[PDB]
Design an enzyme around this catalytic site. Structure first.
Site: not given
Ligand SMILES: Nc1nc2ccccc2nc1N1CCCC1
Length: 370
Positions: A36, A219
């Site tokens: 992530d 992302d």
């Molecule tokens: N990249 C993201 N990781 C997450 C990890 C845990 C919980 C939520 C998460 N949301 C993400 N995003 C990046 C911007 C909004 C969605």
């Protein structure tokens, strides 16, 4: 630049991220960890949960250390919660190194672990700024770099329908053409600036601030390409018009209803190509990246498909739909994100994804929102 240990070290189901093999503790406890680049905590499950099946067992590690401090991560549509600690970590099909790092041992979950996903934790690979509880909890990659001689660099090839993470290096075999780099605007998310958007070469003819309102991030933990309400509407209006020989219900465009053709008869060519011009390394230069319907139409079990471009209220997320066309180099050392056409990308005989440049673009640093 050859890294044959690390090639093909990622696996993953469709829409449920790409994971990697990591070991934690002494003796080593194997876990599948989501990759992530939109978060900065290395967290793992450490307790029983229905959708989990294996987990971190801290009382079995001779090298575990309790930081005696909880951490609580709320977000859009869920939460996770757990106890901070440290332990020796490694990546079997990664650099031959063991490093001590911050691990968040998860104890409460809520709409976080996904059923039949086969990942047990998350490896946030972005910057301390957005680490929980605060920016002084060092993210794993920093630890890795500071405790070894591994360059400050990772690259990601993600293949639609497995893929590779190369820690410390660019593997030329994973991609063809040239790498083109865009500045990391600021070091929290891998935030970058988009200066122009095209559907089949037609400009959205939009004030470019709208493209990065209130940010544009890269992302690997988001499936879709998410765009700002204003940009989304015009984009779908343009994609609609370009694929208008066949028509679909409003519900398909909203990412809900599947659409299906008979096996092997998918008219990819009736759908338009989407291009993002990103800010370049040199003044007044952009390069563009160009993705196909094969990237923004996600396969689901006829050949069936789900539209993978959705509205956003938090800015442009360049998710997996984008990343799946490109070898994406995360060059933290030189503060920039490099794109090349992916050698493993899905395309038809007649159209390929692409990375072209340069283009003369004036006033590109007006394209950020503040
Ligand atoms: N990249 C993201 N990781 C997450 C990890 C845990 C919980 C939520 C998460 N949301 C993400 N995003 C990046 C911007 C909004 C969605």
């Amino acid at each position: 630049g050859s890294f044959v240990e690390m090639v093909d070290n990622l696996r993953g189901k469709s829409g449920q991220g790409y994971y990697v093999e990591m070991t934690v503790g002494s003796p080593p406890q194997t876990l599948n960890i989501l990759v992530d680049t939109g978060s900065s905590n290395f967290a793992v499950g450490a307790a029983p949960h229905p959708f989990l099946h294996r987990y971190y067992q801290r009382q079995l590690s001779s090298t575990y250390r309790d930081l005696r401090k909880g951490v609580y991560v709320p977000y859009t549509q869920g939460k996770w919660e757990g106890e901070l600690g440290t332990d020796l970590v490694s990546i079997p099909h990664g650099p031959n190194v063991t490093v001590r790092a911050n691990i968040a041992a998860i104890t409460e979950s809520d709409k976080f672990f996904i059923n039949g996903s086969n990942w047990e934790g998350i490896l946030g690979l972005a910057y301390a700024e957005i680490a929980r509880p605060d920016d002084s909890l060092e993210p794993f990659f920093d630890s890795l770099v500071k405790q070894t001689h591994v360059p400050n660099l990772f690259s990601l090839q993600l293949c639609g329908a497995g893929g590779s993470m190369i820690i410390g290096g660019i593997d030329h075999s994973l991609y063809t053409g040239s790498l083109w780099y865009t500045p990391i605007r600021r070091e929290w998310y891998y935030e970058v600036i988009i200066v122009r958007v095209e559907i089949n070469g037609q400009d959205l003819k939009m004030d470019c601030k709208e493209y990065n309102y209130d940010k544009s991030i890269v992302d690997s933990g988001t499936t879709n390409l998410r765009l700002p309400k204003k940009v989304f509407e015009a984009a779908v209006k343009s994609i609609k018009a370009a694929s208008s020989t066949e028509k679909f219900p409003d519900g398909f465009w909203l990412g809900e209803q599947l659409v299906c053709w008979q096996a092997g008869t998918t008219p990819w060519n009736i759908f338009p190509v989407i291009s993002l011009y990103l800010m370049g390394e040199v003044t007044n230069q952009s390069f563009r990246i160009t993705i196909l319907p094969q990237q923004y139409l996600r396969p689901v079990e006829d050949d069936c498909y789900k539209f993978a471009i959705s509205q956003s209220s938090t800015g442009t997320v360049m998710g997996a739909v984008i990343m799946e066309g490109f070898y994406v180099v995360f060059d933290r050392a030189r503060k920039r994100i490099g794109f090349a056409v992916s050698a493993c990308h899905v395309h038809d005989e007649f159209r390929t994804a692409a990375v072209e440049g340069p283009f003369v673009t004036l006033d590109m640093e007006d394209c950020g929102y503040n």
